[PDB]
Amino acid sequence: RKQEVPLPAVGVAVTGIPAIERLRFKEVDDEAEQTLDLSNHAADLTQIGD
DNA sequence: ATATATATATATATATATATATATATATATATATATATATATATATATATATATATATAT
Numbered sequence: 143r144k145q146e147v148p149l150p151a152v153g154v155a156v157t158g159i160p161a162i163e164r165l166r167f168k169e170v171d172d173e174a175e176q177t178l179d180l181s182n183h184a185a186d187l188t189q190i191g192d
Numbered sequence: 193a194t195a196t197a198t199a200t201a202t203a204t205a206t207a208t209a210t211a212t213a214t215a216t217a218t219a220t221a222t223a224t225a226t227a228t229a230t231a232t233a234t235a236t237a238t239a240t241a242t243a244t245a246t247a248t249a250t251a252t
Contacts, residue, residue: 166239
């Protein structure tokens with residue numbers, strides 16, 4: 143009951159064409175900490191070359 | 193009448209053949225257990241499509 147009968151191929155679906163663009167890489171998430179710093183950056187005082 | 197010899201009833205001893213009882217060893221069948229490979233099923237992450245909810249907007 144696992145022989146293969148000679149019935150035709152009808153409704154032949156073509157899909158999953160392996161375009162190399164379709165691959166996306168793993169998105170490993172980071173959860174260690176947060177970048178809260180939003181200081182005013184007062185070091186911006188003018189000191190520029192002559 | 194006498195003297196001899198034999199026969200009948202019953203059991204025991206010895207031999208022959210049949211059959212059963214006992215034991216062992218073997219071959220066989222079988223059950224079973226294991227191992228391998230394969231297929232199948234479930235869980236998780238992500239992409240895709242469908243459906244619903246909410247809101248806007250036309251007509252009364």
